[PDB]
Amino acid sequence: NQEDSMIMNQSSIDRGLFRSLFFRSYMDQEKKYGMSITETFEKPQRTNTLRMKHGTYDKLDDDGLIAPGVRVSGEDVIIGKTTPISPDEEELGQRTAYHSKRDASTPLRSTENGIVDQVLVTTNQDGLKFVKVRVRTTKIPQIGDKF
Amino acid sequence: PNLNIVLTCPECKVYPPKIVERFSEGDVVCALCGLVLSDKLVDTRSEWRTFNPLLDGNNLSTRIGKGETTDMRFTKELNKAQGKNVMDKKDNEVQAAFAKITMLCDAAELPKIVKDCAKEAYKLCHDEKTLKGKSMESIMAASILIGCRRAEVARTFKEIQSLIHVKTKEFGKTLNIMKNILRGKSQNLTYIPRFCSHLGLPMQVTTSAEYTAKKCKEIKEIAGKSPITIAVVSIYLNILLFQIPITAAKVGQTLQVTEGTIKSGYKILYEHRDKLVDP
Amino acid sequence: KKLMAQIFFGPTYYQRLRHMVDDKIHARARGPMQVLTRQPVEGRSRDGG
Amino acid sequence: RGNLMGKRVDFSARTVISGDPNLELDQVGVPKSIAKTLTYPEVVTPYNIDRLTQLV
Amino acid sequence: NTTVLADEFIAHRLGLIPLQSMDIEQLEYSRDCFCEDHCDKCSVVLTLQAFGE
Amino acid sequence: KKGIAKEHAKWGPAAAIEFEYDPWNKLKHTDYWYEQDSAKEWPQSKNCEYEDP
Amino acid sequence: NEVFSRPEWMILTCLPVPPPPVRPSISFNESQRGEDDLTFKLADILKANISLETLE
Amino acid sequence: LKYICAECSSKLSLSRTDAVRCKDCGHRILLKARTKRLVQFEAR
Amino acid sequence: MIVPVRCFSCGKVVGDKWESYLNLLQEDELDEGTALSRLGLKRYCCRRMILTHVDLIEKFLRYNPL
Amino acid sequence: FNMKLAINAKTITSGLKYALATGNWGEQKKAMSSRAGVSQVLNRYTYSS
Amino acid sequence: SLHKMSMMAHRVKVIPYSTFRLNLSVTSPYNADFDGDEMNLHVPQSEETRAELSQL
Ligand SMILES: [Zn+2]
Ligand SMILES: [Zn+2]
Ligand SMILES: [Zn+2]
Ligand SMILES: [Zn+2]
């Protein structure tokens, strides 16, 4: 206990003391960069992107989103981007096909892992495809908490 | 010089090699052999976390003014010196046009996408013998409508000339020449919600108006010559099919539209009131 | 066995803080480089030093 | 100051401590995730060969 | 799940319901059991149904 | 599945205990705190009667 | 000191340039190379110099 | 069943631009697809 | 919120007497001390659980989602 | 009497929007009449807080 | 850091249940109670450095 440390009952923690939720959110949306055609929320295939991550992109669906309720690890991907320029020699110039990604897909923060939940999508101020997700993660109290 | 660096494992050589990136350590390894290729990667996101060039062009814009640890006696000299190099570039006129189309689009409350697309439309040509002046406002009036339509947003000519009187035909010829310009360098359904917005109606009349407009576009009876008006009388017949007093004089004064054409469309759909209602 | 002294002991009200351990654990070796200075970059988010 | 007489480093750890009455002064308690994350170079001799081979 | 509660919340809530424990010697630990994934010798199965009526 | 109490309190059956010996301090393993009297500043055990003073 | 310090050098006539690493393009993550402060100011310098030389 | 959007307990089954503002409802926020797929949990 | 299960202090099954502890207030006009007496938790370790639980699930559920 | 007034409306609305977004307390003049902590992000941890 | 203290070396016994752990003795020269303060750690790379940390 010395110098304001604490002894605790892990059996009481088992019984259900001090359990806690943890919501986190994400902001993501598209842009027009032409020659007015905007980005897309596509599900990547193998030959889709430019400089693909190692995200193991299977957790997404055809709308380029993740269905809620499944579990995610730290490095996993949840959103998908694609570059809409138009005109920059769109999918046959200086790259393979792998058409026009330059993919800036947002992975989760690489430490915390949990359950995604209740993904909503709604147009922004000017009218675009604008996406927010929320992930739910239990954190049982551990040795290193400030009480 | 060929300006080229290609990465290849010196011990596998099966292809342009199947390689991966370990960004968490910033290194690259040929996945087959398991040997590094290079190290000390440069981040690709931290710069976007750190802090309109395509429309301002290669030359870069700079506004100058005052601060805290300065003197008013020379910041007024700076305020009268900030225009000593605006004549070196045509970008002073480019940004004057940008400012004026900003005036126009935000005056008509148009969004950022519409503003930037009009900026794009002006920057596209910005100088031809086809342009040839033409009041310098006809070009921006064409460009804002071009950017609006290519933003999949429809705005009326009546709105455009409520914004600027461009005598409606210099505007038209500017539209034609800008159309040819853009085709060289290479939709009225959304009018309906703005009309019902100005009229204040719920959804079902709007959906019915869209359905009837689709059906009348399919069948016959152009009958109004700019079918904007037969769309309008489709709303008129829908609201008379319901029981909300949106009488013809009120509609005409609201939409600045011809009531005789309203009665003509009323007669021609009075004939064809049959096949236009789903529930 | 019996305990020599005696203890003041009973119910009391506590509460929980925010600075949990998983946002503060952080370690790194031979990671990303900052292009201005060729040094390790900042931030627990992007795996700093 | 921020680049020459002080700068960022490598091989670094940063957590929060707790006491213990069973570890003497020259030791320190180190958590195993950090032990996985860090490293240390060695050399290959006739002496360390088998232990290094096993640990590889 | 549809409730206004979380799912692992419901799980930890469930985990404390005790059960009948007479014949507990008869069955076997899953760690020592030769099967995989909860044979009838080593575990039991629970079903719960509710409805918003 | 099976589980035991020692790794998690889910399988604990006990959830209470009571424990007493030498209710009357005869073994004198410990004294009592007092400010003016050992006796009156403390209550008797409920187990008092089964052993003599 | 004659070998290293002579006051005509103390007046600027010909100006060296800094290399690309000191003024690096940040590659601003959607379409820009993200040109920075030093290259920006040097471009200003070249513009003003060419203006003065044409004027004279 | 792909979208909900509203207080309706309706499997709206929207895919692409079929009056995204919900017809028998009055919403424009477009709730999305509580998952059919089976989940795993761990109640230890 | 929900009255929890298995007291941190003692650990017996708690919440059986929960809505009972309710209805020993309204239709009995009964003081809580003797209510907890006839309720019958002779320790205090469980008595505190119901003494300081505050319902939240009512205020939760009187939304109308979906 | 119409074309300028709507961009005036843009200026007034944009000015208030910029002010209550940033917390720089003044018009677009790079921190004149400048004092910062006027537009704090609302603390949203605990009802008491 | 203020003085010659705060700079100890240590040996290591590797511990699970991720956090640090150290002796209750050395606490006051470290000038830190357990109020949540964080520590900083470094690891030498070569033998000269390791030896001089060990011996000094
Ligand atoms: Zn290889
Ligand atoms: Zn089995
Ligand atoms: Zn709806
Ligand atoms: Zn209890």
From Swiss-Prot, chain B:
Database matches in PROSITE patterns: TFIIB, ZF_TFIIB
Subunit record text: Associates with TFIID-IIA (DA complex) to form TFIID-IIA-IIB (DAB-complex) which is then recognized by polymerase II.
GO biological process, one term: DNA-templated transcription initiation
Phylogenetic placement of the source organism: Eukaryota, Fungi, Dikarya, Ascomycota, Saccharomycotina
Other remarks in the entry: Present with 6750 molecules/cell in log phase SD medium.
Pfam family for this entry, one: Zn_Ribbon_TF
Sequence repeat locations: 104-180, 195-271
Protein name as it appears in the record: Transcription initiation factor IIB
